């Protein structure tokens, strides 16, 4: 399924994922697309920072959802 990750530049990247993918794995796919190390990525959805060990389906993230990426140092 398809999800979107919007960065603070307004750049929107699109991701191929499955509901069972971890947040860790989503950040690995972001790294593949932008060269951003996973430890620097905060992913935001429904007013929360998403925990690496949990899955998309744990957060009820459906296809076409937008995550927001905010980086740290």
């Amino acid at each position: 399924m398809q999800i979107f990750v919007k960065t603070l530049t307004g750049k929107t990247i699109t991701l191929e994922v499955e509901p069972s993918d971890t947040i860790e794995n989503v950040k690995a796919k972001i790294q593949d697309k932008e060269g951003i190390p996973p430890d620097q990525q905060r992913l935001i959805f429904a007013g929360k920072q998403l925990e690496d060990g949990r899955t998309l389906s744990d957060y009820n993230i459906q296809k076409e959802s937008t995550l927001h990426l905010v980086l740290r140092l």
């Binding site: 603070l8 905060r42 935001i44 429904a46 007013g47 929360k48 920072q49 937008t66 927001h68 905010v70």
Partner: peptide, 10 residues
């Protein structure tokens, strides 16, 4: 401010 508190990103 989003950089300081990212829960407001959306």
């Amino acid at each position: 401010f989003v950089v300081t508190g990212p829960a407001l990103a959306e």
